[PDB]
Amino acid sequence: TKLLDILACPICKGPLKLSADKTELISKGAGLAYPIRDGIPVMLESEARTLTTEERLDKL
Template sequence: MVRGGILVKHAAFNTSLLQYLACPLSKDPLRYCEKSQELVNDSLGVAYPIIDGIACLVPSRGRLVEKLPKDPEPDPAAGR
């Protein structure tokens, strides 16, 4: 990223902070998505941006993401 003619390297998010962070809406734990560089609440389907290495946990900055369907429970009768 270039700011004011100076090349600025994106700051990396410190994943050890995940133990202290929670979703501001549900208070559920958050998951770090390396691909999108966001913190994700899987139960609500909301992702929060990480800006310059800092989590932006303002509810209005969150975006809705598609919830992944749960794997279906194996049918015990199918194994017979």
């Protein structure tokens, strides 16, 4: 069991992925990216970054 498997999106309760630059926790389920600051995942809609269009699309 790994941490990323039990954390969930504060807004949609959906799965989170570690961003490629590893500074955020991505919630596609909500079109949001929670920032990781001072070593804490900042789970607040107020602090989250809105995913860009390209980020919301499916690479597939």
